[PDB]
């Protein structure tokens, strides 16, 4: 698995691959790993599938539960803290093979400057969090590859679309090196999924755009 | 006189609900509409419960806010336990009915409140809206068109009973409601709707210049 | 009878609060101002709750001090479980309302207290101050300019009702506050929520500094 | 009948305190002086609470000794959990206020007692003594110069207000204390001596008791 | 009526104590002396509590035997948690005071009893005996020479109030006590002393021919 | 009303015991003898408690059988925790005294019962029998020669008071006992704590063997 | 450590050595291992010092506690049982190195034949007890040497005096073969302690008496 | 990681590096390890990040919690005790790989002599604490290197700025010998963070002064390297 | 670490070194290991610093707690018992590396003879205590060395001054053979600390007096 996140002016993009494995065996080809948690937040989780899904689901419920009860959304810092608490709570289980690591991306409507309102937060197995300051981050078995790829491509991000293309190319580079990450599958029409977040909220990126970008990336490598 | 006591208890509650501001909920073409007399900047009598389920109350704030919270607790737990689609206004009304019934029976003082649970159809389903009224003693009843709670209801009820229009528009319904409320402005009202046209979370507040535009 | 209970319980709370010294809280250009008749150096009726949230009470000390501690407990726990900025005066008022409501109902004796929770904007932020008054019965209500509690309020209320100047100076408010208080310095407990402070708004105005404004 | 009970319990308490011997605590130049009418060879109405915090009470012995022990429990626990210097009289008084408040409310019978918590400055420190009075219902109040409890107070008190001077010394205030008391081995006397390095509390007994008189 | 309730309670306890046999404890040259009117061979009104501490009671047996056991429980526990020499008559009296105070307040019925805790000096030590009386309401008081409990006390108190001599012999002391007692035999008396001369356990019963003799 | 309740409860108890059949226990040369008016074939008012300790009761059966069981429970537990010879009639009486005292005080209804605990010497030992009487309120007292409980006692007491003579034979004693009862076999429950049995003194004297005595 | 106990007509004598060890190091030279538990009982405990002391102290309190509560002393059998219970309770800890074994000596006031009233009870780590019928017993690291010594010397125990003398010689033999048992220290004047119990109760034997016996034994073997 | 603290006349300075590691891999470049706990206290924590961060956050809340509740701040000794209790409480977890060691620095407003009111307290994994009397202390994988550096440089500390400089130089020395400690990053403009505390309270040192100081140390180091062999 | 305690006619003196170690590394140079527990008692604790400090602190509070509650101080035996209970309660943690052993020194006010009122009590890890009868005792990694030193120097102890001198020299000998015990630091002016207790109570010995003794010992050995 590989889930990437990056910051583009005025927004954030998060994208993930579709593969699932059970040892060397490919057990899934269309898993959706990036979720829209609330109107301005997206979560991508890597590791043990069962736990990853439960996390995303519980987390979104807990964010909306706060909103309804208090009439106002949790601050971005509060959202981070709640997610960190959830991860820390799974530490014992994680040591037994039930490890799940999330990657958080969002747009802080309450930040000062709107072009820099994008947020990326990574987490370690103990719940330690870190607000990424260098523009991008990644989690999963192919994260190192994706990060080294983004390092060389980030300078090309100048808008939502170029950002999305870099994200997709990073995922592509991850699959190229990590058998546990799935590359774009042309035969079946399955591509990475992605969420874009800006002042207008979190939006699922249309499959068709990712496919066009994918093909262009492939063509370019050929 | 256990019954007699249960008489006073009941007057005690009714007189608190009586002395409280009034609230009205009505069905309309677009969903359900909630309108209550509310001067407060930050204390709310109308709230979202779940995806297509709304809440409105009249009486003692700390007591119905308590019920509101418990309602949200119940809905979120149920949705997570099963699925979001499994949560319904009927379930929530049923829960409030049982809850108030218990309070009214075993608690020191009855809750001086009256609640309304409303449901709109999910996105795209054609379903007539449902309005439920739960009273301080746990009695429940579903109204087909509108519900009125708090203070002197009859005046407001009758006033509404006469100009009620089904399939009525948001602006039309709003004015109709605000009138009947007079019978018994923006700075003084809390307005929101369960907008059946919304994809998931129907509930939304109509405030400020927008509420202003609608009153216009 | 159930009406006799309520009637009887309600009277006791009022009587207790009535025989107690008065406290006033009002909005001003720089924040909120708290002024209470207090002949004690060491026993406090006005206190900080959280970053931008203040507390003031009138009635039986041991009882409102109890509430004050529980408030601080609530605030600190919420801020830690979520974030500091998620704690609000509205939440605290709500909590007190529920707490007193319960005491008034299930406890041996009602609490002979009246509380006020106030909140000012965060540093550099722009928001109107908020004041909440919670009664012994859990009744809650937010005043737009000032709150009065303890003893004979009407006299003080009316006196203040007359002179309120939104956005008044700190000295103006202080001065105004004492008179309303008087119509009902070594015997005053004064403190403010200073919206101008970066994190912790609460601060006591004592000694020579307080004198200065009188 | 919440109002009736409140009155009866309150009465029951005031009466018990009334039929009890009187106690006085006053601020003197040297800190705090405790003087109480007490014939017993073995029962004390005046005790040390913490390093510079003292305790005095009037009423039913078994009831205020109960409070005395709880106070010592509270102080020792706090000082250990934090630091010795974090324990204060304002704190011990506050605790008693809450405690009696609870007793008065939820216990079968109210406590027929009246307490006084006093605190002097730390060695070499310079601070005005503090005196607190907590009553059977949990009411608290800090007196600037002296406190009187037990039996008929007004005669002793009123006598005190004119009799009182600030900075009156152990002997002078001590007599004023004894005088308001009337208004040798049948009396208990102790002081929180601000001049001692840590444990301020100390009893003045035997021959030394008559000398100061 | 709480004022009324308290009154009825005190009245009930007083009546019970009044209708009960009398007990007396007095200082003497060799220790402290306990004398009680008691027909029974097996049911005792006077007992050892700890090393130098004695117990005597009057009133309803099952109630003061209850307090006696509790006292022994308290003493043994303290001595074990700290050291033997840390247990004192004063502590025991204090405990009984607090205990009776609580019973009198929160229990269905007050305890119809009156207790006396006595302590003598340790072997070879030199200290004046101590006597304490704890009543049914938790009131405690230490008498300098003697204590009387149960039934009509005044007659016995006054009789003793005149008869009393410090440092009386055991025989003399026994006599004042018996005489004082009737003023208000062995097969009807329970006798025991805290013998300051004993090295560790002071308490000892004077029974049978030995007692007869002393009479 | 601590005084009225005390009287009513006490009355309620005394009455119940009064309307019940009578039981008698007396010292005699070979042990202690238990004789009670008992119509029922399988319901026993007399029972063994421990090695040398017996039990007899009058009043409401379910209530005294409850106490009997508790007694057996207490005795067996002691004997096991320490040694058999450490269990005594005095300890059991003391326990019943404390138990009834508590019931009389804190239970809904007082126990309408009156108990008797008896003890004889150990085999080959030489000691005077002991008899204890515990009443519904927890009062205890040891009789030197005999105990009577249930119904109208005075008539049986006096009859025995003039009749009794210690060191009597089993038969002379049995007769004296029955006659006193008469004042106030298919209708009699008889048993003895027999000092000559090696360990378990308790033995029932029933049927023909009872006839001969009679 | 070695603690010995022997029966003589009309009573028992119990004696113990004074040594304490930490591996090969002598850590104590004056430890008192024999305690008067009540007027007619003495306890000697071997093993882990902390536990041994606690046992003797708790045991005596328990015995006196019963006496004051019930007005009479526990029967000798009851005393045995209580001790046995305490030992059984420490089994877990004993397994972990907190093992302590007591030796009980007493005079039974209720026994039919007074010259035969002496009692000696040994205990195993599980609390199993045994009333010794052969006259003597011993506990501790030198107990075998002591017992084998007493076996040859017991015929000499005709009274409490020769019994005390034999006891001391057994302890001496024990120290002669077990480095963990301390012999008589003539330089420092430290000798085994002893308790004698007869119809008149338990009494501590005067050190001067034991020292005299000790010096004689030494002169004899010299 | 390396966190240092030193006493200077009238004050104390605490500074920490910005690196975060996962084995050999650098997982963080801008971690802030020194926190202002209250107006007169600062905490720096080394070890497992997730625990370190929780500690600082909880500890600050506890100190402020007491203040609000009791109307007065905890005494400096009380602050020490509370932190030691927190560390002791994590001893089992620490053994399981969740170790966090704090370093405490503060100014005691109640001490006798204001020029000496600075305080430095170190803690071991069992919660054992120790108030330092030699002027400096350090914690983390580079602490031995930092202390040996400070040992030779401490006599240059005559005020807040020279103290800040020595601290930064000690962190530099730690990064020079401990790959787990991050040196100044000139390319990205990331530098150690620092807090200064004196009678006027605890203050965050501005990045700009730290950045200048760091370049100056580096330039000095280059020069000296060229001068020698 | 090394903490010593000795009896002199009329009293006791207890002194300790100031070193702290983490393996072979010196971690402390001025740790205070001897505390005045109450007016007539001093405690010195060796082992794990965190636990040692906690012990001394808690112990002093417990002693004073009893005094205020009961109006009178605990007997010396009660003090010993309380300390032993505290040690025994740490046995599990100690087995795990949290071992702390105290040394207790005091003057018994209630003892009949004042010249002999001095008391020295040692403790083992199980809470076993022993009232030293030979005049001196020591605890810590240098205790054997110190005790062997005191054994040959003890006969020179005739008052508090010669006592305190023998104590410092014993600590000096301990440091000479145990790297974990700190000797006098002449360069930094850090010396062992000490407490003296006599009928007038427990008093901290002035550093200047210890500094003088230390320097003399050093010049002497030179």
Curated annotation (Swiss-Prot), chains A, G, I:
The keyword Hydrolase applies. GO terms for molecular function: threonine-type endopeptidase activity. Its EC number is 3.4.25.1. The formation of the proteasomal ATPase ARC-20S proteasome complex, likely via the docking of the C-termini of ARC into the intersubunit pockets in the alpha-rings, may trigger opening of the gate for substrate entry. Interconversion between the open-gate and close-gate conformations leads to a dynamic regulation of the 20S proteasome proteolysis activity. One of its GO terms (cellular component) is cytoplasm. The keyword Hydrolase applies. GO terms for biological process: modification-dependent protein catabolic process; proteasomal protein catabolic process. Keywords: Autocatalytic cleavage, Cytoplasm, Hydrolase, Protease, Proteasome, Threonine protease, Zymogen. Pathway: Protein degradation; proteasomal Pup-dependent pathway. It is an enzyme of class 3 (hydrolase). It catalyses: Cleavage of peptide bonds with very broad specificity. The active site is at 1 (nucleophile). It comes from the Bacteria. It is found in: Cytoplasm. Its main location: cytoplasm. Component of the proteasome core, a large protease complex with broad specificity involved in protein degradation. Belongs to the peptidase T1B family. The 20S proteasome core is composed of 14 alpha and 14 beta subunits that assemble into four stacked heptameric rings, resulting in a barrel-shaped structure. The two inner rings, each composed of seven catalytic beta subunits, are sandwiched by two outer rings, each composed of seven alpha subunits. The catalytic chamber with the active sites is on the inside of the barrel. Has a gated structure, the ends of the cylinder being occluded by the N-termini of the alpha-subunits. Is capped by the proteasome-associated ATPase, ARC. This is Proteasome subunit beta. It comes from Mycobacterium tuberculosis (strain ATCC 25177 / H37Ra). The lineage of its organism: Bacteria, Bacillati, Actinomycetota, Actinomycetes, Mycobacteriales. The gene is prcB. The chain holds residues 58 to 279 of 291 of the full protein.
UniProtKB/Swiss-Prot annotation, chain B:
The formation of the proteasomal ATPase ARC-20S proteasome complex, likely via the docking of the C-termini of ARC into the intersubunit pockets in the alpha-rings, may trigger opening of the gate for substrate entry. Interconversion between the open-gate and close-gate conformations leads to a dynamic regulation of the 20S proteasome proteolysis activity. It is found in: Cytoplasm. GO terms for biological process: modification-dependent protein catabolic process; proteasomal protein catabolic process. GO terms for molecular function: threonine-type endopeptidase activity. Pfam families: Proteasome (PF00227). Keywords: Cytoplasm, Proteasome. Transmembrane segments: none annotated. One of its GO terms (cellular component) is cytoplasm. It comes from the Bacteria. CDD domains: proteasome_protease_HslV (cd01906). Pathway: Protein degradation; proteasomal Pup-dependent pathway. Component of the proteasome core, a large protease complex with broad specificity involved in protein degradation. HAMAP family: Proteasome_A_B (MF_00289_B). Belongs to the peptidase T1A family. The 20S proteasome core is composed of 14 alpha and 14 beta subunits that assemble into four stacked heptameric rings, resulting in a barrel-shaped structure. The two inner rings, each composed of seven catalytic beta subunits, are sandwiched by two outer rings, each composed of seven alpha subunits. The catalytic chamber with the active sites is on the inside of the barrel. Has a gated structure, the ends of the cylinder being occluded by the N-termini of the alpha-subunits. Is capped by the proteasome-associated ATPase, ARC. This is Proteasome subunit alpha. It comes from Mycobacterium tuberculosis (strain ATCC 25177 / H37Ra). The gene is prcA.
Swiss-Prot record, chain E:
It holds the Pfam family Proteasome. The formation of the proteasomal ATPase ARC-20S proteasome complex, likely via the docking of the C-termini of ARC into the intersubunit pockets in the alpha-rings, may trigger opening of the gate for substrate entry. Interconversion between the open-gate and close-gate conformations leads to a dynamic regulation of the 20S proteasome proteolysis activity. The keyword Ubl conjugation does not apply. Belongs to the peptidase T1A family. Component of the proteasome core, a large protease complex with broad specificity involved in protein degradation. PANTHER family: PROTEASOME SUBUNIT ALPHA/BETA. This is Proteasome subunit alpha. It comes from Mycobacterium tuberculosis (strain ATCC 25177 / H37Ra).
